[PDB]
Amino acid sequence: TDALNVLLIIVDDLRPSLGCYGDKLVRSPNIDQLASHSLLFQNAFAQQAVAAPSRVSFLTGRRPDTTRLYDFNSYWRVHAGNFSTIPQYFKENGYVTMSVGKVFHPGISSNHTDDSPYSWSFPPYHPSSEKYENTKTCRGPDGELHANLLCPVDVLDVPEGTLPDKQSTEQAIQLLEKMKTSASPFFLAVGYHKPHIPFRYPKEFQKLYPLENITLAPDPEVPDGLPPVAYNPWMDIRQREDVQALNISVPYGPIPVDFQRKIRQSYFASVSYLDTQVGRLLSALDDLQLANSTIIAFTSDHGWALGEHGEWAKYSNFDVATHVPLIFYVPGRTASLPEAGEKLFPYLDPFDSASQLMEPGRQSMDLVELVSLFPTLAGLAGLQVPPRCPVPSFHVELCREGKNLLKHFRPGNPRELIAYSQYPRPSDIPQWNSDKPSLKDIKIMGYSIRTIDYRYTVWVGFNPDEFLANFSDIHAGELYFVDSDPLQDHNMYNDSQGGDLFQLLMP
Amino acid sequence: TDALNVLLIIVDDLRPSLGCYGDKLVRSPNIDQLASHSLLFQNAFAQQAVAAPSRVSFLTGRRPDTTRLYDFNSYWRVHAGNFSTIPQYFKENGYVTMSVGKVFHPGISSNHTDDSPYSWSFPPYHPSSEKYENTKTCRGPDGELHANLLCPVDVLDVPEGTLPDKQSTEQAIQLLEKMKTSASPFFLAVGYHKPHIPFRYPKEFQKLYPLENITLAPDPEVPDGLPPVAYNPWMDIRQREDVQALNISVPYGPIPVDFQRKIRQSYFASVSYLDTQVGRLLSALDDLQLANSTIIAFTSDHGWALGEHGEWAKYSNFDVATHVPLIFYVPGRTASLPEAGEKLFPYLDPFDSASQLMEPGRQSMDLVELVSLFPTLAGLAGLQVPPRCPVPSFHVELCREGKNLLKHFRPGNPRELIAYSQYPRPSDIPQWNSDKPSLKDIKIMGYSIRTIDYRYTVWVGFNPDEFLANFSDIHAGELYFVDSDPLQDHNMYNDSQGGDLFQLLMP
Ligand SMILES: *[C@@H]1O[C@H](CO[C@@H]2O[C@@H](C)[C@@H](O)[C@@H](O)[C@@H]2O)[C@@H](O[C@@H]2O[C@H](CO)[C@@H](O)[C@H](O)[C@H]2NC(C)=O)[C@H](O)[C@H]1NC(C)=O
Ligand SMILES: *[C@@H]1O[C@H](CO[C@@H]2O[C@@H](C)[C@@H](O)[C@@H](O)[C@@H]2O)[C@@H](O[C@@H]2O[C@H](CO)[C@@H](O)[C@H](O)[C@H]2NC(C)=O)[C@H](O)[C@H]1NC(C)=O
Ligand SMILES: *[C@@H]1O[C@H](CO[C@@H]2O[C@@H](C)[C@@H](O)[C@@H](O)[C@@H]2O)[C@@H](O[C@@H]2O[C@H](CO)[C@@H](O)[C@H](O)[C@H]2NC(C)=O)[C@H](O)[C@H]1NC(C)=O
Ligand SMILES: *[C@@H]1O[C@H](CO[C@@H]2O[C@@H](C)[C@@H](O)[C@@H](O)[C@@H]2O)[C@@H](O[C@@H]2O[C@H](CO)[C@@H](O)[C@H](O)[C@H]2NC(C)=O)[C@H](O)[C@H]1NC(C)=O
Ligand SMILES: *[C@@H]1O[C@H](CO[C@@H]2O[C@@H](C)[C@@H](O)[C@@H](O)[C@@H]2O)[C@@H](O[C@@H]2O[C@H](CO)[C@@H](O)[C@H](O)[C@H]2NC(C)=O)[C@H](O)[C@H]1NC(C)=O
Ligand SMILES: *[C@@H]1O[C@H](CO[C@@H]2O[C@@H](C)[C@@H](O)[C@@H](O)[C@@H]2O)[C@@H](O[C@@H]2O[C@H](CO)[C@@H](O)[C@H](O)[C@H]2NC(C)=O)[C@H](O)[C@H]1NC(C)=O
Ligand SMILES: *[C@@H]1O[C@H](CO)[C@@H](O[C@@H]2O[C@H](CO)[C@@H](O)[C@H](O)[C@H]2NC(C)=O)[C@H](O)[C@H]1NC(C)=O
Ligand SMILES: *[C@@H]1O[C@H](CO)[C@@H](O[C@@H]2O[C@H](CO)[C@@H](O)[C@H](O)[C@H]2NC(C)=O)[C@H](O)[C@H]1NC(C)=O
Ligand SMILES: *[C@@H]1O[C@H](CO)[C@@H](O[C@@H]2O[C@H](CO)[C@@H](O)[C@H](O)[C@H]2NC(C)=O)[C@H](O)[C@H]1NC(C)=O
Ligand SMILES: *[C@@H]1O[C@H](CO)[C@@H](O[C@@H]2O[C@H](CO)[C@@H](O)[C@H](O)[C@H]2NC(C)=O)[C@H](O)[C@H]1NC(C)=O
Ligand SMILES: *[C@@H]1O[C@H](CO)[C@@H](O)[C@H](O)[C@H]1NC(C)=O
Ligand SMILES: *[C@@H]1O[C@H](CO)[C@@H](O)[C@H](O)[C@H]1NC(C)=O
Ligand SMILES: *[C@@H]1O[C@H](CO)[C@@H](O)[C@H](O)[C@H]1NC(C)=O
Ligand SMILES: *[C@@H]1O[C@H](CO)[C@@H](O)[C@H](O)[C@H]1NC(C)=O
Ligand SMILES: [Ca+2]
Ligand SMILES: [Ca+2]
Ligand SMILES: [Cl-]
Ligand SMILES: [Cl-]
Ligand SMILES: [Cl-]
Ligand SMILES: [Cl-]
Ligand SMILES: [Cl-]
Ligand SMILES: [Cl-]
């Protein structure tokens, strides 16, 4: 009897545009193969659709209103409370805990040291080539180098001759090889960068998605019923040279159709590129015979809009921005243990037109939240599940605000039917800082309820000095029905009275 | 080590107009003395403010939408499911279970046998003199007999020379004396009739409340903001001779001021009369030395309006109609065990101007529901608490839809902050059957949420054939704030958006 290892894979800005989530266009064979042996959650949502707030949230197991982190300019241990993290908890239980890539958000939100010395057994590894993502590293048709958003590259024509996710994969494999020697179990967090912007990927992956076979989003127009307060102006992508040359109006655009399809091409190519890296990582896990002793959690910190509602990027409460993939492989529970010389995660080449997305593994339609990642991994690994947090929990160091999802591997509280998301705004009209408002400039907080049936959102007055929401100062509301309006194009909040919330509360 | 006895006292139509609930006018010294040794719940509410629906609810531990009993014309075991009752459960655990007075509602709702043979050890006792309550038994100033609503009587001038609650008290005492012999513990349910109409009580109690020192209700007018659908026309009291002679308009009245004060006099007198009966019962319990081995639960099936909002009687979702008293005496837990020859419930005479309401015993402001009576008594008595019901539970015989209140004797689910009530209507405009609509005539169901902060009610379309509420067909709504509008005179539903419900759902 031993304790199970944990491989936590985090992808930056990855929406569930994956074969195992019903996407019949994107080629993600390696991730789909992971799902075939795993429990896949169809309705998992981040608590805020932006990096640091989401990562600090699900790494401490607390919600944004407990971390009080809505931008990226505060360290929770000083700002809110001495909250323990997932890797800190495993390390305190005899694990060797290791970080590769973007797990914590860099900077002050992790005290510039990836939350040292609490979380990790040694100073994390961050790939060097990431610092060239936003340099003049994209060679164009006429031979010059540019800082482009769409950046298919020959690896032999970029600085250091590599890409950050290839480095992370390589380093993760070496650490896996090392841990096969150690007597201690490992908790390995690998944080991949793509498909986060810019879309810098080996140019060969672009051939998987010719533009002729690329369509726009189903709902590229800005909906009439979308209140301006809920719109994010996607300002960061406007700074890239190729985007800047199109002279796209602020804040509503639209992006020219031809470039919209090019964005979707490069995003899809980056996903398939990401998928091969995951393939290499999981394949090495198989070769090392760790598949029967290692939990594998695969998820993302938030989604990314690709033209839906005339929106791009995250910074939103729409499903496209909050819906994330969430897959859990548990040796001998989500699948039969691998027998003699059996391989569960053999590398699959997206350039091979074969098979049929494999079969969908276990699936769950329950509404779940990233803030449940902490208790789930602690339970799946055989450790003590931290207790439920009181309200408030600024003074508690080890507790969880999310539910454990272990029951899903074999009394109806209404909150178990809800995935919560939120996002701040500095004003009602989209302006320069509406994507990523700093704490002092937040004046509105949009709180959103997502059920199997609808998304209910209210944009309410917010006081950043007292961290106080005023649910009597509702600036605007949104109500989208999954059955009739899955794309969320027809806001029904004005025609509503609140009977949907009453119904949810009524036993 | 032994099991504790249970004395469950139920009062028909008793609102918390009691000294131990802050009423500085009504004299209820014996009940207040029970409270001084008990845990008193300040915010307990029935699930529907009318007899059979409420009694079948809290006796089976299920809600009205599980019993599907909204009138008094169906037996749950045939109509909904083979639901077990509190006394049935105790009897199955070696208790002698006994019923005196109105515990179950008589008629088909209890199969005309008080739910025989499941609930009781022998056919219950019902006082004979109750059948004279609605006869010409009230002697008037000119010497004739009338069927009056206000019925102060000399006991020597009524049929059989007694009153139903005196008989019940006497019979309960005899059963207590008998059980002091038995080796088995007892579960004794005593159901008192007054202050249910008519107000027939020993006329001496009328002297405790001279009319000069009687005021009207604080809010005797019908509020402008009260939707007609939520108004009950109080038709039953209009049939009494003294009421009929005033020629009170239907359905809004008002009742003449002088008669309003007379109603309140007779109600208060009936409460003090009830209190002495409780005094006799509890005093006999003390004399028999059962105070250290007997749980005592005191409550009511619902309230009664005394002019608030121009309303009278129950059939309502207002606090006055749904708020009930709820007191739990637990030997050695809510108070120190009685030592040698100590008496905890000595009879107190309301005609003695002495003391000062005693001291308030333990108190709890948590919002609780009568449907929690089943699990609480089962726990307090040392028995296994039935499990929480699934949804739906028509097929389950033993389970509870309410929470156990044992924690109150030494994760925040929003439903633990709510007491639920409801009431049906046959139409929006008050009509002949708006007080007590029969199932087939129900077209609207008013669902109400009560928190520490507000009461939120929606009157929605209801289909009695499918037992289906349509929360998209809201006929009207109500929102009353406890802090600013404790009397519930200023409906704020039209100025509201639903942010109060959202706030309750948001962790
Ligand atoms: C913040 O907490 C860390 C570690 O918390 C540990 O785990 C918690 C679940 C709880 O059990 C704590 O009591 C644990 O200490 C603190 O780091 C410890 O600091 C003490 C002295 O300050 C030191 O002796 C320990 O070795 C440290 N342990 C670790 C794992 O680093 C830290 O001090 C806390 N910070 C504040 C400001 O309270
Ligand atoms: C947050 O980090 C600071 C600084 O971390 C130090 O410097 C980094 C570059 C890196 O090398 C870390 O490993 C270092 O610990 C912490 O402030 C330092 O705390 C130590 C106490 O161990 C003290 O000796 C130093 O003087 C401090 N440095 C400064 C500039 O004040 C700080 O404690 C960390 N916050 C928390 C909550 O742990
Ligand atoms: C929380 O909000 C309430 C309500 O906000 C008001 O109504 C909104 C629709 C919008 O018009 C706001 O600008 C309004 O202020 C605030 O209640 C107001 O309080 C002020 C000052 O006390 C008073 O002058 C107004 O009359 C109040 N309005 C109402 C409708 O009650 C309340 O002040 C806010 N609380 C905090 C702490 O900011
Ligand atoms: C309705 O239930 C009664 C009693 O239910 C009992 O308690 C429940 C918690 C559960 O444990 C049941 O299995 C128990 O029986 C049934 O009454 C019993 O009926 C059987 C034969 O029908 C008889 O042998 C038992 O002695 C009866 N027990 C009692 C206490 O009366 C009754 O049959 C059920 N009715 C229907 C229609 O299902
Ligand atoms: C509901 O009650 C009826 C009738 O109860 C009988 O008659 C009463 C006056 C009283 O004396 C009760 O104790 C009697 O049991 C039940 O119908 C009877 O069921 C018995 C089976 O025990 C059968 O022999 C009789 O013929 C039935 N009588 C009639 C008129 O049909 C009925 O079973 C009870 N319902 C439930 C769910 O228990
Ligand atoms: C449940 O209620 C909806 C909504 O009720 C409608 O709106 C109310 C304000 C009131 O005006 C009602 O009379 C309305 O019917 C019902 O939806 C309606 O369904 C009918 C028939 O399918 C259709 O003709 C209407 O256009 C619908 N109206 C809306 C606003 O959607 C629904 O039918 C009810 N469900 C059941 C089972 O009765
Ligand atoms: C929902 O209703 C609100 C208000 O009822 C609408 O916002 C109003 O828009 C008008 C212009 O048409 C302005 O003059 C008002 O000042 C606005 N009201 C407030 C409170 O700001 C909103 O446009 C409606 N939305 C939809 C989709 O119909
Ligand atoms: C997981 O599977 C591998 C290979 O299938 C197992 O490898 C064995 O490991 C033990 C010690 O861990 C060695 O003594 C054996 O020689 C290895 N090979 C075989 C064929 O057993 C590994 O033990 C498995 N892990 C667990 C926890 O059962
Ligand atoms: C709350 O609003 C509703 C509707 O907005 C009011 O009901 C309306 O009353 C008018 C008469 O003033 C009728 O002509 C309408 O037909 C009613 N509407 C509906 C949907 O029936 C209601 O009176 C308002 N209540 C308060 C207290 O202001
Ligand atoms: C409750 O108190 C009474 C009197 O204070 C106790 O009465 C005793 O009962 C036992 C058997 O039940 C007799 O043997 C004694 O003679 C009785 N008198 C005394 C003074 O003990 C009674 O036992 C108490 N009940 C419990 C459960 O402790
Ligand atoms: C688009 O897909 C179809 C279906 O396989 C394929 O035949 C066609 O060649 C694709 N388009 C291009 C430009 O390759
Ligand atoms: C961009 O467009 C605006 C008007 O839409 C025009 O005034 C401006 O000169 C344009 N800029 C460039 C660089 O084309
Ligand atoms: C009303 O109460 C006061 C206060 O005790 C008392 O003095 C007065 O006599 C009472 N009224 C009547 C009519 O007795
Ligand atoms: C009752 O009052 C109505 C008018 O308010 C009148 O028509 C009727 O005759 C009165 N009935 C009696 C019995 O006084
Ligand atoms: Ca991100
Ligand atoms: Ca009653
Ligand atoms: Cl990194
Ligand atoms: Cl170029
Ligand atoms: Cl596409
Ligand atoms: Cl009776
Ligand atoms: Cl007379
Ligand atoms: Cl009064």
Side-chain angles (χ1 to χ4, degrees), chain A residues 44-62:
Chain A
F45 294 86
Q47 279 48 92
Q48 183 177 342
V50 65
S54 175
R55 290 167 181 271
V56 173
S57 172
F58 69 69
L59 286 173
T60 60
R62 314 293 174 92

Side-chain angles (χ1 to χ4, degrees), chain B residues 93-165:
Chain B
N93 279 283
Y95 278 66
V96 176
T97 66
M98 306 168 288
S99 181
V100 175
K102 179 180 180 174
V103 177
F104 281 105
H105 187 82
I108 184 60
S109 70
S110 53
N111 202 29
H112 307 281
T113 64
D114 303 288
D115 189 44
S116 168
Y118 310 104
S119 291
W120 311 107
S121 303
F122 60 81
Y125 173 88
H126 302 289
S128 55
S129 56
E130 188 282 330
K131 69 172 152 288
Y132 307 108
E133 291 282 325
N134 296 312
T135 65
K136 289 175 169 294
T137 182
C138 316
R139 190 80 64 171
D142 290 279
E144 298 303 77
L145 289 169
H146 312 273
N148 281 338
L149 182 77
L150 317 185
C151 193
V153 290
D154 183 341
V155 173
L156 301 176
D157 193 19
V158 305
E160 288 181 340
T162 187
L163 299 177
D165 294 326

Side-chain angles (χ1 to χ4, degrees), chain A residues 403-421:
Chain A
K403 47 167 172 168
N404 182 345
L405 312 177
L406 201 148
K407 62 216 169 186
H408 292 100
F409 305 83
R410 293 174 294 95
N413 183 327
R415 290 179 170 163
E416 295 196 57
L417 306 172
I418 302 173
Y420 295 97
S421 297

Side-chain angles (χ1 to χ4, degrees), chain A residues 27-181:
Chain A
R27 284 182 171 275
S28 59
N30 296 279
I31 295 172
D32 300 349
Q33 188 173 237
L34 172 68
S36 73
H37 308 294
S38 300
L39 174 56
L40 183 153
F41 286 93
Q42 297 179 0
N43 299 316
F45 294 86
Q47 279 48 92
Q48 183 177 342
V50 65
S54 175
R55 290 167 181 271
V56 173
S57 172
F58 69 69
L59 286 173
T60 60
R62 314 293 174 92
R63 298 183 176 279
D65 290 12
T66 298
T67 66
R68 289 185 177 179
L69 183 68
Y70 315 114
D71 53 20
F72 64 91
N73 304 93
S74 65
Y75 184 38
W76 76 90
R77 296 191 184 265
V78 172
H79 194 232
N82 198 25
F83 308 149
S84 295
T85 65
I86 306 180
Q88 175 184 0
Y89 182 72
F90 278 81
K91 187 174 76 172
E92 246 122 57
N93 279 283
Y95 278 66
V96 176
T97 66
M98 306 168 288
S99 181
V100 175
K102 179 180 180 174
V103 177
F104 281 105
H105 187 82
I108 184 60
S109 70
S110 53
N111 202 29
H112 307 281
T113 64
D114 303 288
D115 189 44
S116 168
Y118 310 104
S119 291
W120 311 107
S121 303
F122 60 81
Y125 173 88
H126 302 289
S128 55
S129 56
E130 188 282 330
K131 69 172 152 288
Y132 307 108
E133 291 282 325
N134 296 312
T135 65
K136 289 175 169 294
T137 182
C138 316
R139 190 80 64 171
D142 290 279
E144 298 303 77
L145 289 168
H146 312 273
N148 281 338
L149 182 77
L150 317 185
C151 193
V153 290
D154 183 341
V155 173
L156 301 176
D157 193 19
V158 305
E160 288 181 340
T162 187
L163 299 177
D165 294 326
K166 304 175 83 73
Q167 293 185 280
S168 294
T169 301
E170 295 167 47
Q171 178 59 15
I173 295 174
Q174 292 299 321
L175 288 169
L176 292 165
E177 293 182 357
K178 174 61 179 177
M179 287 308 307
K180 220 210 163 185
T181 303

